[PDB]
Every structure is written in structure tokens, then in C-alpha cells.
């Protein structure tokens, strides 16, 4: 494992690495609409998804549980333009149920996330 | 009059719920029970200005999503259902 623990419990559940420094002072706030590109990989490096296959940035509302916990925690720490890598333990991802067929039970996930933009609503 | 729901609201609420059933509760059956009446209502066609705009903007995408779901029924390949949800998401993010 490599990365800085960004969990509030400091349980090493979500470890972050900055791949490209962004441009804010500002990080997105609860409820903001956030626009990202991303890639997701299993712990063996196998890709399970890339945002680019949908031909536009992925959008979700931050801090509402629309996405797995690791993303709500990780994206809240990012600045506009940043790229980071998140290592996500199963307790902060899909847990024992997984996200079949691609994601098994008890899977640690890797995401690369580029924060493109965020707005208040 | 005012209480009669129209295309945009029915799809917004329905996609939300179908997605909770599928991604949240792993309930493909329930997901289909929500989506099928929504596609079936599109067949009656737009009955208002708002519905005609909605149908012009989103009708083709929803009909494609139904095609991917019908394929899933035969293939069982979850990638087919994923294609459908990319289209439902594409519609949902624009109406919401
Ligand atoms: C086709 O591709 C899928 C995404 C795929 C599914 C399979 C996974 C491997 C994956 O490949 O994404 C993936 O890479 C992944 O793990 N993702 C996607 C990127 C964000 C992080 C993670 C995730 O949390 O996905 C999410 C994960 C799979 C499920 C959620 C995890 C958190 C939990 O609290 C939620 O309970 C409900 C369920 C999926 C999403 O990010 C989408 C956007 C969100 C939802 C479905 C729910 O939040 C839903 O709740 C009602 C909503 O409020 C939405 C906005 C309502 C509208 C109509 C539905 C849109 C559906 C879009 C679906 C999309 C583009």
C-alpha cells in the first residue's frame, strides 16, 4: 500500500496520492455537482471502468452517498484540475456484496480521478 | 390537471428508483418492473408541449436503452445492462 490516509477514522481505508497538483485554494463542498474523469482498477491492476467510454465527464453530487464512500471522502479533498489516485479498502467501496460481475466480494479498488469542475448545484 | 404527471417527472422519479433497486439492492426483477411501464407510456406519444420537447430530446436514447435491456433478457450479459444504464444516466443527468 502506498498513499496518505485521508479517512476520518484513520483506519487506512482510503489512501491518496496526488498525481497532478490542481488549482484552487478551494475543494468542493457538500452537495456540489462535481465533474470528473476516472479509471477504476482491481488490486491486480485489471481495469474495470473508464469514464471516457461515456464520452463526457462523469457527474455526481458530492457527500450524498450517490457514490461509494471512498469517492465522497476522496473527491472532497481535491482541488480543481487535480489528479489523484485512491486506494479504497472494501469497507469504503462495495464490501462483502461486491459489484458483480466485475468487482468481487471484499475487493480493494484503485481509482484515478481527475477533478474537472464543481459548482454549487 | 396539475396533479397529472408528465414524461419528465415520471422518468426522473422512475430512473432514480430503478437504479436504487438495481445498484443498491441487486434486484434486476424490481428494476425491470419500474422501467417497463415507463417505456410502455412513451408509446402513447407526447400529449403536451413539454412532453414533445422531452420526446424529441430523449426519446431515441430511451428506445435504445430498451433495446439493450431486451438484449440482456436474451444474453444475460451484464455489459448489455450497463449500456442501457449509460443511456438512462445520460438522460437523467440532463433532465435533473
Ligand atoms: C452504467 O455505469 C454505471 C456506473 C458503473 C457501475 C459499476 C461500477 C463498478 C462502475 O463501473 O460504475 C464504477 O467504476 C464505480 O465503481 N463507480 C462509478 C464512478 C463513481 C464511483 C463508483 C460508484 O460509486 O458507482 C455507483 C455504484 C455502482 C452504486 C451506488 C454506490 C453508493 C450507494 O450509496 C448507492 O446506493 C443507491 C449505489 C454508481 C453511480 O455512481 C451512479 C451515478 C449512482 C447511482 C446508481 C445512485 O447514487 C443512484 O441512487 C439512487 C442515484 O442517485 C443516481 C444519480 C440516479 C440515476 C438515475 C442513476 C444513474 C446510474 C448510473 C450508472 C452508471 C453510470
Amino acid at each position: 500500500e502506498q498513499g496518505e490516509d485521508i479517512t476520518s477514522k484513520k483506519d487506512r481505508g482510503v489512501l491518496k496520492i496526488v498525481k497532478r497538483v490542481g488549482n484552487g485554494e478551494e475543494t468542493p463542498m457538500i452537495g456540489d455537482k462535481v465533474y470528473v474523469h476516472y479509471k477504476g482498477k482491481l488490486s491486480n491492476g485489471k481495469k474495470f471502468d473508464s469514464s471516457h467510454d461515456r464520452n463526457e465527464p462523469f457527474v455526481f453530487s458530492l457527500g450524498k452517498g450517490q457514490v461509494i464512500k471512498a469517492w465522497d471522502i476522496g473527491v472532497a479533498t481535491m482541488k480543481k484540475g487535480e489528479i489523484c489516485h485512491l486506494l479504497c479498502k472494501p469497507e469504503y467501496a462495495y464490501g462483502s456484496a461486491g459489484s458483480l460481475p466485475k468487482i468481487p466480494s471484499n475487493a480493494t479498488l484503485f481509482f484515478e480521478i481527475e477533478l474537472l469542475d464543481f459548482k454549487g448545484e | 390537471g396539475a396533479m397529472d404527471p408528465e414524461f419528465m417527472e415520471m422518468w426522473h422519479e422512475g430512473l432514480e428508483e430503478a437504479s436504487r433497486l438495481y445498484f443498491g439492492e441487486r434486484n434486476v426483477k424490481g428494476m425491470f418492473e419500474v422501467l417497463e411501464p415507463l417505456h410502455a407510456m412513451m408509446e402513447r406519444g407526447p400529449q403536451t408541449l413539454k412532453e414533445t420537447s422531452f420526446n424529441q430530446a430523449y426519446g431515441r436514447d430511451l428506445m435504445e436503452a430498451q433495446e439493450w435491456c431486451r438484449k440482456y433478457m436474451k444474453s444475460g450479459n451484464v455489459k448489455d445492462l450497463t449500456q442501457a444504464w449509460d443511456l438512462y444516466y445520460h438522460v437523467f443527468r440532463r433532465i435533473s
Side-chain angles (χ1 to χ4, degrees), chain A residues 35-84:
Chain A
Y35 295 79
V36 304
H37 280 302
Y38 72 90
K39 187 175 286 190
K41 304 181 149 178
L42 303 178
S43 61
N44 57 10
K46 184 173 191 171
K47 188 169 71 154
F48 62 79
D49 200 12
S50 163
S51 60
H52 292 288
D53 297 336
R54 309 192 182 88
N55 303 319
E56 64 190 355
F58 178 81
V59 64
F60 72 103
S61 293
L62 187 68
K64 294 190 72 62
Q66 287 179 4
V67 298
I68 54 168
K69 292 177 185 174
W71 271 55
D72 266 347
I73 294 162
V75 174
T77 69
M78 298 181 73
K79 294 164 181 287
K80 190 165 161 179
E82 183 179 317
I83 300 173
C84 79

Side-chain angles (χ1 to χ4, degrees), chain B residues 31-43 45-46:
Chain B
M31 176 203 76
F32 278 130
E33 285 171 348
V34 173
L35 299 170
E36 289 170 1
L38 290 172
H39 290 289
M41 105 180 283
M42 294 301 284
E43 295 166 8

Side-chain angles (χ1 to χ4, degrees), chain A residues 38 48-49 54 58 65-68 71 94 103 111, chain B residues 15-16 19-20 23 82 85-86 89 92:
Chain A
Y38 72 90
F48 62 79
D49 200 12
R54 309 192 182 88
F58 178 81
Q66 287 179 4
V67 298
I68 54 168
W71 271 55
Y94 295 102
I103 300 179
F111 284 94
Chain B
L15 294 179
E16 275 188 307
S19 78
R20 186 191 67 78
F23 296 104
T82 301
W85 275 104
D86 282 342
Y89 173 52
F92 181 81

